[PDB]
Design a protein around this ligand. Structure first.
Ligand SMILES: [Cu+]
Ligand SMILES: [Cu+]
Ligand SMILES: [Cu+]
Ligand SMILES: [Cu+]
Ligand SMILES: [Cu+]
Ligand SMILES: [Cu+]
Ligand SMILES: [Cu+]
Length: 40
């Protein structure tokens, strides 16, 4: 029941990858390029 959420990630691998902007693996603290552990 819980898998994707909302990758509003503006990182460098989130802005170019729109295939994970609806199911990324980051919490609600992924709004800055850091240790963003997104999909890949
Ligand atoms: Cu994300
Ligand atoms: Cu990201
Ligand atoms: Cu993403
Ligand atoms: Cu992010
Ligand atoms: Cu992330
Ligand atoms: Cu993510
Ligand atoms: Cu992300």
């Amino acid at each position: 029941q819980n898998e994707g959420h909302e990758c509003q990630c503006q990182c460098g691998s989130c802005k170019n990858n729109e295939q994970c902007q609806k199911s990324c693996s980051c919490p609600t603290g992924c709004n800055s390029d850091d240790k963003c552990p997104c999909g890949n």
